[PDB]
Amino acid sequence: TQQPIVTGTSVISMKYDNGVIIAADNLGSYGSLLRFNGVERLIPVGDNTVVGISGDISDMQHIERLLKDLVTENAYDNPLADAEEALEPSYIFEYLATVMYQRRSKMNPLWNAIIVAGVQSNGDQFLRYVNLLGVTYSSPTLATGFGAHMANPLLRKVVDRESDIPKTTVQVAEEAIVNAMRVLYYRDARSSRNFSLAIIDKNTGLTFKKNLQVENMKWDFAKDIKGYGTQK
Amino acid sequence: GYDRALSIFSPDGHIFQVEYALEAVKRGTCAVGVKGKNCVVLGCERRSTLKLQDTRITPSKVSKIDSHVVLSFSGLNADSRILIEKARVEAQSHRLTLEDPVTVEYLTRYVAGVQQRYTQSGGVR
Amino acid sequence: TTIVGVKFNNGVVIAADTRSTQGPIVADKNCAKLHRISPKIWCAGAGTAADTEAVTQLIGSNIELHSLYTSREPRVVSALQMLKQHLFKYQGHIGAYLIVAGVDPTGSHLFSIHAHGSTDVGYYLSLGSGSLAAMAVLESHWKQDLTKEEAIKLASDAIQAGIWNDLGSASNVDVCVMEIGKDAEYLRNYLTPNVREEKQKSYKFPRGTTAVLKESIVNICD
Amino acid sequence: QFNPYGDNGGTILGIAGEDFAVLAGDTRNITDYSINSRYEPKVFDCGDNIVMSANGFAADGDALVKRFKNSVKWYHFDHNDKKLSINSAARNIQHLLYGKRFFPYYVHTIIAGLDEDGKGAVYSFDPVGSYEREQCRAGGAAASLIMPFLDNQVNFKNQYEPGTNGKVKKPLKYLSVEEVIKLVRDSFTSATERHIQVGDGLEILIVTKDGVRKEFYELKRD
Amino acid sequence: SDPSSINGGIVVAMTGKDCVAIACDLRLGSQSLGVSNKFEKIFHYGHVFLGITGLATDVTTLNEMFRYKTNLYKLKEERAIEPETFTQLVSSSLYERRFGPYFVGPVVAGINSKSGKPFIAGFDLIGCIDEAKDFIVSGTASDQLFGMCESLYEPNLEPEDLFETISQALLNAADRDALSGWGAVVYIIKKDEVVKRYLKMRQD
Amino acid sequence: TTTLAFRFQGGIIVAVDSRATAGNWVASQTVKKVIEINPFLLGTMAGGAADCQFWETWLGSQCRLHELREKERISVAAASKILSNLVYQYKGAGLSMGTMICGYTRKEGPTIYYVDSDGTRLKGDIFCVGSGQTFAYGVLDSNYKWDLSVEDALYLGKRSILAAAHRDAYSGGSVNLYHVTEDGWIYHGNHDVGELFWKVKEEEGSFNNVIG
Amino acid sequence: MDIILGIRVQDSVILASSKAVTRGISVLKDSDDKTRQLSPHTLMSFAGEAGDTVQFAEYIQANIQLYSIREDYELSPQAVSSFVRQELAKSIRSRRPYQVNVLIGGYDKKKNKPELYQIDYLGTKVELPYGAHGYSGFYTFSLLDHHYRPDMTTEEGLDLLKLCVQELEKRMPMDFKGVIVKIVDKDGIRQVDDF
Amino acid sequence: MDIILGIRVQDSVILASSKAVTRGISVLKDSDDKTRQLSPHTLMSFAGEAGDTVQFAEYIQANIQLYSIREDYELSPQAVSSFVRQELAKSIRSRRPYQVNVLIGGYDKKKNKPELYQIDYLGTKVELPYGAHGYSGFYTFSLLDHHYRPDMTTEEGLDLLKLCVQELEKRMPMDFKGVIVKIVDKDGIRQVDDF
Amino acid sequence: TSIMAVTFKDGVILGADSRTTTGAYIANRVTDKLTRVHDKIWCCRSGSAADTQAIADIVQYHLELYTSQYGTPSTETAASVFKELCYENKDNLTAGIIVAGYDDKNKGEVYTIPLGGSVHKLPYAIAGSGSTFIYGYCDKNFRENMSKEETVDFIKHSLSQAIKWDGSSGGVIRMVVLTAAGVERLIFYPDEYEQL
Amino acid sequence: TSIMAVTFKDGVILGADSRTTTGAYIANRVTDKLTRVHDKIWCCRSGSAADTQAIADIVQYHLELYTSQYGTPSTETAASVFKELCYENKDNLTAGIIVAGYDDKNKGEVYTIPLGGSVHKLPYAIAGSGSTFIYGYCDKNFRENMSKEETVDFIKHSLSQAIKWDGSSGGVIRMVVLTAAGVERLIFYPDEYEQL
Ligand SMILES: [Mg+2]
Ligand SMILES: [Mg+2]
Ligand SMILES: [Mg+2]
Ligand SMILES: [Mg+2]
Ligand SMILES: [Mg+2]
DSSP, rough: OOOOOEEEEEEEEEEEEEEEEEEEEEEEETTEEEEEEEOOEEEEETTTTEEEEEHHHHHHHHHHHHHHHHHHHTTTTOOTTTTTTTTOHHHHHHHHHHHHHHHHHHHHOOEEEEEEEEEEETOEEEEEEETOOEEEEOOOOOTHHHHHHHHHHHHTHHHHOOOSSSTTOHHHHHHHHHHHHHHHHHBTTOOEEEEEEEEEETTTEEEEEEEEEESSSOOOOGOOOOOOSOOO | OOOOOOSSTTTOBHHOOOHHHHHHHHOOEEEEEEOOSEEEEEEEEOOOOOOSOTTTTOOOOOSSSSSSSSEEOOOOOOHHHHHHHHHHHHHHHHHHSSSSOOOOHHHHHHHHHHHHHHSSTOOOO | OOOOEEEEEEEEEEEOOOOOEEEEEEESSOOOOOOOOOOOOOOOOEHHHHHHHHHHHHHHHHHHHHHHHHTSSSHHHHHHHHHHHHHHHTTTSSOOOEEEEEEEEEEEEEEEOOOOEEEEOOOOESSTTTHHHHHHHHHHOOSSOOOHHHHHHHHHHHHOOOOHHHHOOSSOOEEEEEEESOOOOOEEEEEEEEEEOOOOOOOOTTTOOSSSEEEOOOOOOO | OOOOOOOOOOOEEEEEEEOOOOEEOOOOOOEETEEEEEEEOOEEEEEETTEEEEESSHHHHHHHHHHHHHHHHHHHHHHHTOOOOOOHHHHHHHHHTTTTTTOOOOOOEEEEEOOOTEEEEEEEEOOTTTTTESSSEETTTTHHHHHHHHHTSSSSSOOBBBTTSSSSSSOOOOOOOHHHHHHHHHHHHHHHHHHHHHOSEEEEEEEEETTEEEEEEEEEOO | OOOOSHHHHOEEEEEEETTTEEEEEEEEEEEEEEEEEEOOOOEETEEEEEEEEHHHHHHHHHHHHHHHHHHHHHHHSSSSHHHHHHHHHHHHHHTTTTTSSEEEEEEEEOOOOOOOOEEEEEEOTTOEEEOOEEEEETTTTTHHHHHHHHHHSSSOOOOOHHHHHHHHHHHHHTBBBTOOOSSEEEEEEEEEEEEEEOOOOOOO | OOEEEEETTEEEEEEOOOEEEETTTTSOOOOOOEEETTTEEEOOOOOHHHHHHHHHHHHHHHHHHHHHHHHHOOOOHHHHHHHHHHHHHHHTOOOEEEEEEEEETTTTTEEEEEETTTTTEEEEEEEETTHHHHHHHHHHHHHTTTOOHHHHHHHHHHHHHHHHHHHBBTSSSSOOOOOTTTTTEEEEEEOOOOOOOHHHHHHHHHOOOSSS | OOOEEEEEEOOOOOEEEEEEEEEEEEEESSSOOEEEEEEEEEEEEESSTTTTHHHHHHHHHHHHHHHHHHTTTTTOHHHHHHHHHHHHHHHHHHSSOOOOEEEEEEEEEETEEEEEEEOOOOOOOEEEEEEETTTHHHHHHHHHHHHOOTTTOHHHHHHHHHHHHHHHHHOBBBOEEEEEEEEEEEEEEEEEEEE | OEEEEEEEEESSSSEEEEOOEEETTTTEESSOOOOOETTTEEEEEEEESTTHHHHHHHHHHHHHHHHHHHHOOOOOOOHHHHHHHHHHHHTTTSSSOEEEEEEEEETTTTTTTTEEEEEEEEEOOEEEEEEOOOTHHHHHHHHHHOOOOTHHHHHHHHOOOHHHHHHHHHHSBBBOOEEEEEEETEEEEEEEEEO | OEEEEEEEEEEEEEEEEOOEEETTEEEEESSHHHHHHHETTEEEEEEEEHHHHHHHHHHHHHHHHHHHHSSSOOHHHHHHHHHHHHTTTTTGGOOOEEEEEEOOSSSSSEEEEOOSOOOEEESSEEEEGGGGGHHHHHHHHHOOOOHHHHHHHHHHHHHHHHHBBBOOSSSSSEEEEETTEEEEEEEOHHHTTTTT | OOEEEETTTEEEEEEEEEEEETTTTTESSSSOOOEEEEEEEEEEEEOOHHHHHHHHHHHHHHHHHHHHHHHHHOOHHHHHHHHHHHHHTGGOOEEEEEEEEEOOSEEEEEEETTTTTOOEEEEEEESGGGGGGHHHHHHHHOOOTTTTHHHHHHHHHHHHHHHOOTOOSSEEEEEEEEEEEEEEEEEOOHHTTOOO
């Protein structure tokens, strides 16, 4: 048993017709102190998987090393490590999910909420969640922390059920994700303007975008707001 | 720990350490058991090569395992004490858990089991 | 519960869902959560249900008496000031959280009020367990100088976000529109789901199924 | 302090017919007032004509199903591909559960299938392994809402034959698979209306001598 | 310890076509111990019926209080109180004990003598009105009652059909509650006749 | 819960209720609170359901191994002590068990041992365990005799559970009856308390306080 | 205090109350009368917290005696029981509640009927054919449920009461030092001096 | 368990132990023998936590019986008591201590003297002319301090014991259902079947 | 919350962020924490919003009644009324208030009233959760008798950093300028102050 | 405690105060919080003195054994060893450590290891109770590729303010300069830095 110290907020994601998108801001908070501003919380595994992690950053860095070690280990005595016997999103998730549930069962959890996003060998989209309790679930849209409360409602307006996925393009999906990140910046006190976004497409592969910023913000209406009731 | 297999099979299918243990029994003083209609008698030989012995305190050849069962033996005297102690402990353990004293057959089966165990355990004769 | 308030060019609109729960159990599928303080000052609340209703009626009562005394139509700042001072006095033991909206001779207003007695001003506000689902929709689409039509749409879309995504929010959408210089128009069940459930069975029993020991006429007349 | 447990909501229902058995459950997964998934399967085909659901804390539920499926695999390996009977599976699950008696699987487990005489069978477990063969058993969030209805409509409790006035009970006539599926759908439709954790979808697994079949029905999403 | 579940018991009310029904179990207990099988929880003031579940001392106290208040109401108003008006009186009376409440779950049932409209209403222990068209439930088996009522209920039932529906709702709900049962009473209420029926049920 | 067991001329009568509750919620009315350890030995369920089920099933496995090894029926004394010694090892860990181990052997005759999760092992003639034990004891104590017939003894045990099922909120559902003889136990059926109550009331004239 | 029982038969009400007074470690008295006569045909037995029991009982006694003098009339048992219930219901939300449980046994001279009321410290009133407080009912109700008849004589009620006390003396852990038994009928209140 | 008394007279040791076994609300048994014979001339009575009492007693009994067989000799009461004290002293710093208090009454055949040892669950041993555990001594020691004589007969010890039990039955709140009395002398151990 | 008040040559300027949080949720991102208790006496509020609003409303009432009887009150008088409420009700309040005002006789004045109800007259004052991160910056960069533009820059830069590090602070930067010329409201948006 | 490490053109400089408190009592006013784990790899310690001394001693041991086998370790390697101890024993440690070192290949590097056991490579780092007060100042005044004299001034000014506001910080300002030229120790007394 512990308590999280340096933490990362929401990770948000969704499926679209040819793949998945995932995003997370670049902040590492120390309680109410916005201590670290250059933290990458999206960690790619090969060219077909991206693992987005929220929660305790020290545990994230540990998981990051486990994934790095997983790639090394898979390459051992494996002539098809860059082909048929390459790591799949489903392999990477199941491994993490096993670790997370084992850790909670020893009453020593990895204080995280994780979303594994990727594309399988057969082109199928993969998107599944796991947290410190070892709880797992899948959905067309997935989000952690504040994103679960604010991002999911917005993303579910685009893909409300399974049948909406083929109808959703990457431009529409990315647009919805980018808007959700803006909304979270407005309303989450532990968020930052800077974020990373990753797209895993079955045709164009893995596109990793760093140093993105929340833009087109509405603040002008603040000038007219005066007092808290009677003040003019 | 010392794990050496002392009791092993020979080409002719004999375990010599067990057979040589019988030769130790052959050397031991004679013991005899006879059961009547309403009694059992245990007779034991005392070799008279040892006089000046104190018969009050010298270990007697027949030992009570419980108030209703006795054990006599032929062979190594020191070895017999280990079996007698184990049998006595088991007799009390039986009374404690089953709430009934051991049958003569049960006590025999236990002692015999200990003897067998020492014929296929490592590091023991 | 999901409640929103949205300001527009010449008025204000307040909206709410209609689910009323006892914990995880639903008691009323069509609760009217939109209330009156005065004819053109409406409110809706979350928290302790009896406290939101009781505090609305009490201030509404005094607002009426005040309006009569002063020969003036009641102001939203008056409902606001009377509410917060009452709630503050009780240090949040009256679990009343409200969104208060209305028009008066001064203009159109939108306030949120919290159990401990703090108030807020805004052009769009949300409240209840569905507050975050609603605010996500409001932060995505609210703009300055909305028309009455746009503001009703934004408000009811914000409630829908709560209905679908919040377990404590469900069923229908109630709306009340307070435009300046007009009568406030209250739109009960402004949105309903189309379609109606039909069960596989009818459970209507055969008569005489229940066993009975006694019968008697109850004298209800004097 | 770290809480190793959680509640993912959900409601499941197992009914044993004369020559069949069903095990149903909603497809909604939740924490607190949020929806995690509208479709997250909860009832599983575990092989050898056995269906299983472990409702409550989904991490423990997934672990237990995973371990039992594994136990079926090793039962075949160890006993010449012998078919694991429903009664043997039940006793096996008791041991899986009781092995964690002092750090339990926070779940209410139900399995369904056919016994060795071809008759329908449902077994119900508590979190630490106590079990019983039953005819009808609801588990999870809305179990208290469903079971009284089932006592009334499956076992005809409190129902007497008209004209006799409580002297003759309603006879217990056998129900068909189609009749049972109606009671299941109506049970979940009612539960969805009055319980906030129940909704989204209903997946039923039917077990006969011909094998395992699935049926899916939508539920309200609010 | 929990005051609302020391004595046990349940009340349910339903609306039908030109009629209302209200029903209750007869148990009073001290936790596990059954004390009385004749503790009726439904009372009436004129043509307005009030069922009360919860802590039995408060049930008795509130009955006496509402008899008190409806009697004075009648003397002054020169007419019997109506269900809608009484509902507000119950709400008012409960909320005046906001920070020292009666541990009860009241249920009002009746027909307006002037409009002929059937009426039911429920309250939490501090007066929040639940104003539902179909049915109102209360007591230690309220979950069970919600389940029964949601599935068994259909609108516009005739008086004698409504009797069967509400009776089966109560009975089967009570049989899944340890602290409810030991007998049951059902009131069928029409504009100018009320029938009271005692049900036969298991006594465990 | 209400369970009882008593010794008499014809052996042992075992009678239990069938109700299981989780708070006020009645989880089941069809619970088997008599565990058939083997064809000669019975155990009652009270306290923890899993604890009683699991360890009394395990007890049957130990009794079976005993008679394989010793070629003789296990005594009720020895069987009961296997269970009491086991739970005593777990003492403090949180097992919950209140059971009567009932049997009829040659050397002992009809024998009952109350075994309990804090290590208690008591031999006796009459035992009653559960939330409704006090109600059952009253009927038992005032009507018990050694020279009861098997028929009258069965009824007494049935009537004593009924008494408890009526007054105790957490007891009821149905009554399960068993008669333990030297040649093994004999099941004497499941009796719905609902139907039993009215039947007994009429035939016996008891429960005048209740209207029927 | 500990055991207080009551049984209403054909023509009378019988109250049985334990004699022991225990203060922690020692039994200070074995002849305590846990009852007060409220009026010639109304008797109240009591049990609960030390001090509060007698204070409450004597307070009720005084109020009923005052009423009897003012009106030159004996209140009905039902009226007395309703008065007592209100006092206890009032008490439960007080600064320091009376922790007292009572049984009221009276003979209504107007209706010519015995009546037994059971009221707990919360103000929970019930009219019964037989009643008790504390754990007393747990041991005795199964016997009363079996043997009770509404047409029992006073002698039959006493015999059934003996059976109840015998079961209490067998299965109760505490020594309550026997019971004092009193009968309430049309002729008033009298104590059975041999029990 | 509850009351265990002991008194050493001229030529014997008398142990009196209550018969009741109470599990919370009900008295489950009224004929329980809270004693074990450790050897022909040594008896141990016990009281304490449920389960631990009998488990400890039977464990001691087995160990002494084992010693008796191995050496064909009966240990002196003093030796048996020292063994028991060590086991309890060992137990008190264990993971889960035996919560058992004992009295050891024995006749030393070598010295031709009766001996009574009192040992509590901590391993606190004392040799006494008379002893008890729990609250038993609070009621009885004033009577024993007054009447006791080291030259008392067995019959006089039994009469003094009756007086002690009578005082316990009067002032103790709990019903301990009488006592089983056993005498330990040169001829061994016997039970007084009428007390 | 990040609030400050700074005296300068021509008077005094109050500054504040606009973020109001309930845990990690931003309940209001456009809050006005600069409140008017008299024409040229304003305050910056920190702590319980309910408490600081209630206090400010009472003070505004007291100064309105004061003005009706004795004419325009001094900034010191306003601070005293604040202090009296905060000190006497210290057990039931969580309020940290900075009082700033302009007289013609006294010019710009700043009073800070921390949790206990003590009063401290200062050249400038900082308060709120975000103030902790700018004690060093403000101490190094403050000068007496700055110009209006320098003081606006000083406050803008200071609160920019407070917002940068404190998650409880954010939104826009509001300011109120108090001089002989009158009362001027200023607002600065994220895209302006974040790039400083 | 007030500690910091700053990279500059020629390498890196560590800085620290010298105050060690037991409650409000200053148990040591001349503490050396700049500790050497290798020739040109030093660290700044914050948190439990017992824990940070124990950790530093173990690290010094590990790097000594590393050097005997594999030659001079990198600053990254030193940080990893620190992290490994801090992360794996996070339940039983209260340590906040800044690691600074000079390679010829990598030049000046700074790693901060906060409470949880995470590692963060930064241009400069601040830590300790007094760091809170200089987040604003340090962010505004830090530049990359400063000169030795500029970096000394930056650290001197920064810790001067941290000491000014934090009661847990004080005494002298110690500094250690790590360059290709070698290792230089600096000390600055109160009469020097208080007047800045
Ligand atoms: Mg729902
Ligand atoms: Mg919803
Ligand atoms: Mg019931
Ligand atoms: Mg019952
Ligand atoms: Mg910020």
